[PDB]
Design a protein around this ligand. Structure first.
Ligand code: HEM
Length: 390
């Protein structure tokens, strides 16, 4: 066992030295995650083995095949990240068309408009927390409107969602899930009581009524859960980590400002360097198998370090150098394989628009002190707060 809680807050703040320590000793290792989680299992820290692990049919995401149960599954229902083919294939079909880049570009003007408004409000203040004034409100606004639930309670949803994704206590975690399941049941019933609506959630409602076996009521609830929660807690961090990383590497920021053409690739290099999802979600071995010649037992949990893979020097030369010209085409920030992030085109767009607009409208943007508290859970990378001035 390697208890990662033993490295304390240093690891929370900067995990990469430890991932490097481990990657030198091999591609995979049995570990205990830090508190409060304290989860035991195989952690994959090399790129090639991480990548292959992400595409491996021997790793199930569905704990109920082993009689195991979790709060998400029982209270929200089955959603994409906790199902294997063929069920996965069904559910993903329902939504995949909605999230291609071509389709998602239809939202650009609204995204640009939300971005302009938030900037209009923030800029006169001369300084702000980037997170509250900008990075948080943009994603949430966009995903609610695409879902067709524009009028939701942001503040409450964010608090419920905050707990769910980075939990503090086990009772507060349970509390969050019950309340969010109830809130989502209610929002689904609201949509059912209105005239038919041309948005994603409306489309899902209709699909279930046309054929119960294509989509159960449980799965309908759980889809809305995952789209809303991924839809915000995570693009927020990409934007925030983007700004933070640019403003702490002012030569890259200068190079970008000199050629704004470099933006899309800059965003990719942030995905590599400080990817918001640090470790991938739940997998276990469906059968006995091996990762780079280490024996893994049937039922063993496998955690794939996406960000550790991003800093593997075997894949990414000078891995700790943030270089916007690298424009890395092969990072695992969005996963790999059949579960490859559904939202990747949308998240890219949002961050693209946010960063360009923020940069063009704040030419002397600068960090206004150290950033706020990092969430515990080495499942997420980001900061609760980012004070900036301009
Ligand atoms: C910077 C932003 C984001 C990052 C870094 C990210 C990352 C990921 C990763 C790594 C996975 C795969 C995890 C695994 O295999 O265990 C994934 C899956 C997914 N993401 Fe995202 N995500 C982002 C934004 C979004 C957004 C905006 C949505 C909005 C709809 C979304 C929806 C999903 C869904 C539905 C899946 C499940 C796909 C499947 O299971 O087939 N994500 N995401």
């Amino acid at each position: 066992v390697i208890d990662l809680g033993e490295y304390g807050a240093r690891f929370t703040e900067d995990p990469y030295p430890v991932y490097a320590e481990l990657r030198e000793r091999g591609p995979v290792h049995w570990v205990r995650t830090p508190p409060p989680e304290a989860f035991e299992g195989w952690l994959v820290v090399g790129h090639e083995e991480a990548r292959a692990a992400l595409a491996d049919p021997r790793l199930s995401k569905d704990g109920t095949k082993k009689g195991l149960t979790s709060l998400d599954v029982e209270l929200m229902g089955p959603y994409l990240l906790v199902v294997d083919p063929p069920e996965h294939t069904r559910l993903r079909s329902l939504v995949a068309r909605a999230f291609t880049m071509r389709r998602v570009e239809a939202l650009r003007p609204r995204i640009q408009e939300i971005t302009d408004g938030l900037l209009d409000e923030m800029l006169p203040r001369g300084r702000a927390d980037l997170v509250d004034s900008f990075a948080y409100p943009l994603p949430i606004t966009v995903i609610c409107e695409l879902l067709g639930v524009p009028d939701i309670d942001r503040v409450t949803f964010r608090a419920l969602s905050n707990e769910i994704v980075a939990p503090t206590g086990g009772d507060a975690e349970l509390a969050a899930y019950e309340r969010l399941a109830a809130y989502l049941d209610e929002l689904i019933d609201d949509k059912r009581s209105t005239a038919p609506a041309d948005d994603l959630l409306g489309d899902l409602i209709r699909t279930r009524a046309e054929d119960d076996d294509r989509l159960s009521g449980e799965e309908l609830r759980a889809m809305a859960f995952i789209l809303l929660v991924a839809g915000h807690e995570t693009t927020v961090n990409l934007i925030t980590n983007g700004v933070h990383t640019l403003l702490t590497h002012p030569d890259q920021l200068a190079a970008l400002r000199a050629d704004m053409t470099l933006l899309d690739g800059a965003v990719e290099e942030v995905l590599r360097f400080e990817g918001p999802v640090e470790t991938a979600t739940y997998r276990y071995a469906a059968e006995s198998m091996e990762i780079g010649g280490t024996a893994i037992a049937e039922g063993d949990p496998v955690m794939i370090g996406l960000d550790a893979a991003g800093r593997d020097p075997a894949r990414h030369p000078d891995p700790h150098v943030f270089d916007i010209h690298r424009a890395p085409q092969g990072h695992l920030a969005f996963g790999h394989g059949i579960h490859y992030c559904l939202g990747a085109p949308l998240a890219r767009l949002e961050a693209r628009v946010a960063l360009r607009s923020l940069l063009e409208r704040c030419p002397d943007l600068a960090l206004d002190g150290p950033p706020g508290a990092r969430p515990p859970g080495m499942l997420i990378r980001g900061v609760r707060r980012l004070p900036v001035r301009w």
